[PDB]
Enzyme design. Structure first.
Site, PDB file in Angstrom:
ATOM      1  N   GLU A  85      -4.002 -21.156 -14.122  1.00 49.77           N
ATOM      2  CA  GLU A  85      -5.058 -22.578 -14.285  1.00 49.77           C
ATOM      3  C   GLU A  85      -5.708 -22.727 -12.807  1.00 49.77           C
ATOM      4  O   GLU A  85      -4.854 -23.491 -12.070  1.00 49.77           O
ATOM      5  CB  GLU A  85      -4.770 -23.225 -15.715  1.00 49.77           C
ATOM      6  CG  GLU A  85      -3.373 -24.073 -15.314  1.00 49.77           C
ATOM      7  CD  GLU A  85      -2.111 -22.868 -16.220  1.00 49.77           C
ATOM      8  OE1 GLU A  85      -2.163 -21.842 -16.141  1.00 49.77           O
ATOM      9  OE2 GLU A  85      -1.407 -24.413 -16.307  1.00 49.77           O
ATOM     10  N   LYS A 117       9.717 -23.011 -19.821  1.00 49.77           N
ATOM     11  CA  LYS A 117      10.239 -21.505 -19.281  1.00 49.77           C
ATOM     12  C   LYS A 117      11.254 -20.838 -19.360  1.00 49.77           C
ATOM     13  O   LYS A 117      11.346 -19.866 -20.861  1.00 49.77           O
ATOM     14  CB  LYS A 117       9.396 -20.672 -17.937  1.00 49.77           C
ATOM     15  CG  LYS A 117       7.846 -21.073 -18.133  1.00 49.77           C
ATOM     16  CD  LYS A 117       7.466 -21.565 -19.068  1.00 49.77           C
ATOM     17  CE  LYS A 117       5.711 -22.006 -19.093  1.00 49.77           C
ATOM     18  NZ  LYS A 117       5.243 -22.253 -19.908  1.00 49.77           N
ATOM     19  N   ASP A 175       4.262 -21.515 -24.691  1.00 48.52           N
ATOM     20  CA  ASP A 175       3.671 -22.247 -23.583  1.00 48.52           C
ATOM     21  C   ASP A 175       4.303 -23.317 -23.593  1.00 48.52           C
ATOM     22  O   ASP A 175       3.791 -24.344 -22.859  1.00 48.52           O
ATOM     23  CB  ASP A 175       2.183 -22.425 -23.849  1.00 48.52           C
ATOM     24  CG  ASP A 175       1.469 -23.274 -22.678  1.00 48.52           C
ATOM     25  OD1 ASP A 175       2.318 -22.124 -21.541  1.00 48.52           O
ATOM     26  OD2 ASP A 175       0.844 -23.430 -22.928  1.00 48.52           O
ATOM     27  N   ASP A 202       2.002 -17.629 -22.301  1.00 49.42           N
ATOM     28  CA  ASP A 202       1.879 -17.575 -21.033  1.00 49.42           C
ATOM     29  C   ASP A 202       2.412 -17.514 -19.677  1.00 49.42           C
ATOM     30  O   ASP A 202       4.188 -17.899 -19.853  1.00 49.42           O
ATOM     31  CB  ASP A 202       1.469 -19.490 -20.863  1.00 49.42           C
ATOM     32  CG  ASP A 202       0.538 -19.281 -20.394  1.00 49.42           C
ATOM     33  OD1 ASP A 202       0.119 -18.951 -19.609  1.00 49.42           O
ATOM     34  OD2 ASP A 202       0.310 -20.969 -19.622  1.00 49.42           O
ATOM     35  N   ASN A 203       2.181 -17.719 -18.240  1.00 48.89           N
ATOM     36  CA  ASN A 203       2.571 -17.918 -17.309  1.00 48.89           C
ATOM     37  C   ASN A 203       3.834 -16.864 -17.172  1.00 48.89           C
ATOM     38  O   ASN A 203       5.408 -16.912 -16.258  1.00 48.89           O
ATOM     39  CB  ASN A 203       3.524 -19.273 -18.054  1.00 48.89           C
ATOM     40  CG  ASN A 203       2.851 -20.370 -17.789  1.00 48.89           C
ATOM     41  OD1 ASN A 203       3.514 -20.887 -17.915  1.00 48.89           O
ATOM     42  ND2 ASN A 203       1.321 -21.043 -17.002  1.00 48.89           N
TER      43      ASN A 203
HETATM   44  C1  LIG Z   1      12.404 -26.092 -25.396  1.00 50.83           C
HETATM   45  N1  LIG Z   1      11.490 -27.114 -26.780  1.00 50.83           N
HETATM   46  C2  LIG Z   1      10.216 -27.525 -27.132  1.00 50.83           C
HETATM   47  N2  LIG Z   1       9.729 -27.923 -27.817  1.00 50.83           N
HETATM   48  C3  LIG Z   1       8.445 -28.847 -27.957  1.00 50.83           C
HETATM   49  N3  LIG Z   1       7.985 -29.080 -27.027  1.00 50.83           N
HETATM   50  C4  LIG Z   1       8.407 -28.684 -25.724  1.00 50.83           C
HETATM   51  C5  LIG Z   1       9.418 -28.226 -26.003  1.00 50.83           C
HETATM   52  N4  LIG Z   1       9.780 -27.558 -24.450  1.00 50.83           N
HETATM   53  C6  LIG Z   1       8.468 -28.230 -23.378  1.00 50.83           C
HETATM   54  N5  LIG Z   1       7.418 -28.838 -24.018  1.00 50.83           N
HETATM   55  C7  LIG Z   1       6.343 -29.554 -24.364  1.00 50.83           C
HETATM   56  O1  LIG Z   1       5.471 -28.444 -23.964  1.00 50.83           O
HETATM   57  C8  LIG Z   1       4.705 -28.143 -22.846  1.00 50.83           C
HETATM   58  C9  LIG Z   1       5.670 -28.317 -21.379  1.00 50.83           C
HETATM   59  C10 LIG Z   1       4.869 -27.295 -21.230  1.00 50.83           C
HETATM   60  C11 LIG Z   1       5.926 -26.706 -19.917  1.00 50.83           C
HETATM   61  N6  LIG Z   1       4.980 -26.014 -18.506  1.00 50.83           N
HETATM   62  C12 LIG Z   1       5.197 -25.495 -17.229  1.00 50.83           C
HETATM   63  O2  LIG Z   1       5.298 -26.472 -16.727  1.00 50.83           O
HETATM   64  C13 LIG Z   1       4.335 -24.873 -16.953  1.00 50.83           C
HETATM   65  C14 LIG Z   1       3.652 -25.059 -15.721  1.00 50.83           C
HETATM   66  C15 LIG Z   1       2.692 -24.231 -14.523  1.00 50.83           C
HETATM   67  C16 LIG Z   1       2.947 -24.743 -13.163  1.00 50.83           C
HETATM   68  C17 LIG Z   1       2.633 -23.493 -12.763  1.00 50.83           C
HETATM   69  C18 LIG Z   1       2.324 -23.293 -10.820  1.00 50.83           C
HETATM   70  C19 LIG Z   1       2.813 -24.433 -10.346  1.00 50.83           C
HETATM   71  F1  LIG Z   1       3.265 -25.175  -9.263  1.00 50.83           F
HETATM   72  C20 LIG Z   1       3.115 -25.905 -10.845  1.00 50.83           C
HETATM   73  C21 LIG Z   1       3.478 -25.475 -12.801  1.00 50.83           C
HETATM   74  C22 LIG Z   1       1.169 -23.507 -15.608  1.00 50.83           C
HETATM   75  C23 LIG Z   1       1.399 -23.695 -16.648  1.00 50.83           C
HETATM   76  O3  LIG Z   1       0.566 -23.255 -17.481  1.00 50.83           O
HETATM   77  C24 LIG Z   1       2.847 -24.246 -17.447  1.00 50.83           C
HETATM   78  O4  LIG Z   1       2.395 -23.813 -18.607  1.00 50.83           O
HETATM   79  C25 LIG Z   1       4.399 -30.062 -22.867  1.00 50.83           C
HETATM   80  F2  LIG Z   1       4.615 -30.302 -21.163  1.00 50.83           F
HETATM   81  C26 LIG Z   1       6.379 -30.306 -23.406  1.00 50.83           C
HETATM   82  O5  LIG Z   1       6.553 -31.448 -23.864  1.00 50.83           O
HETATM   83 CL   LIG Z   2      -9.143 -21.243 -14.940  1.00 53.58          CL
HETATM   84 CL   LIG Z   3      -3.039 -26.279 -22.483  1.00 56.59          CL
HETATM   85 MG   LIG Z   4       1.573 -22.435 -19.716  1.00 56.26          MG
END
Ligand SMILES: CNc1ncnc2c1ncn2[C@@H]1O[C@H](/C=C/CNC(=O)c2cc(-c3ccc(F)cc3)cc(O)c2O)[C@H](F)[C@H]1O
Ligand SMILES: [Cl-]
Ligand SMILES: [Cl-]
Ligand SMILES: [Mg+2]
Ligand SMILES: [Cl-]
Length: 213
Positions: free
Chosen positions: A197, A142, A139, A167-168
């Protein structure tokens, strides 16, 4: 302050300390009534819960904790002795997650690692004494689902039967990961259609069970 800081306060004041369900409910209420946030949410969360209960994993790895919502969801369903490791590269979010888990009373079941998955995954066996993982929840960013799946395999962390849950896979989508696992004889895949969500927008989870090399 930040939206994530605003969310943790609400849980502390609207949930029962030590009551994970009250924590999940407070986050869902805040995100529905006040400010949207990218927690897995209740719709997909119920699917996650059903998967966790089915496979009864002893060791789960989560990539991307955010505010700790999925960590609370999963950790509350772990059997005594089972453990969750969650990786979160953003130090502010890692601290929110730790505090969320502390408030829920789940801190003994979870380790929150503040670093990037590509740096921490290669350290799991030697530093964190991991043999293989029973389940992985993806999660984080992406475009990192596929690189990290390949890295987990390289590092010897997957076993026959390891469950990947992503997810996603519809929104925002993870097209390279999805095409890869669905096309690979090393994975058996199942799609669970759901909703983004807090939104009336279709999304989904993909379960991909590793079959070995
Ligand atoms: C790359 N390695 C990483 N290692 C450890 N932590 C990490 C790493 N990379 C990110 N993190 C950490 O993982 C997280 C990031 C999650 C990103 N999630 C999303 O973007 C995401 C986006 C939407 C979404 C849907 C519709 C819309 F209109 C706008 C957004 C919905 C979702 O459920 C999501 O999960 C955290 F923020 C980041 O620091
Ligand atoms: Cl929900
Ligand atoms: Cl979560
Ligand atoms: Mg997500
Ligand atoms: Cl225990």
């Amino acid at each position: 302050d930040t939206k994530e800081q605003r969310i943790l306060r609400y849980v502390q004041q609207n949930a029962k300390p030590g009551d994970p369900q009250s924590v999940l409910e407070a986050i869902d209420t805040y995100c529905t009534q006040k400010e949207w946030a990218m927690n897995v949410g209740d719709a997909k969360g119920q699917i996650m819960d059903a998967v966790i209960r089915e496979y009864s994993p002893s060791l789960v790895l989560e990539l991307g904790a955010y505010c700790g919502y999925s960590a609370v969801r999963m950790a509350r369903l772990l059997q005594p002795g089972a453990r969750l490791l969650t990786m979160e590269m953003n130090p502010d979010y890692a601290a929110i997650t730790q505090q969320m888990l502390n408030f829920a009373g789940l801190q003994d079941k979870v380790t929150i690692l503040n670093g990037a998955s590509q740096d921490l995954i290669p350290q799991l066996k030697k530093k964190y004494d991991v043999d293989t993982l029973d389940m992985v929840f993806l999660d984080h960013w992406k475009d990192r689902y596929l690189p990290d799946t390949l890295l987990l395999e390289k590092c010897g962390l997957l076993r026959k039967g390891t469950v990947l849950l992503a997810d996603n896979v519809i929104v925002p989508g993870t097209p390279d990961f999805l095409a890869y696992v669905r096309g690979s004889s090393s994975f058996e895949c199942t799609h669970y259609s759901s909703y983004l969500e807090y939104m009336k927008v279709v999304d989904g989870l993909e379960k991909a069970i590793y079959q070995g090399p």
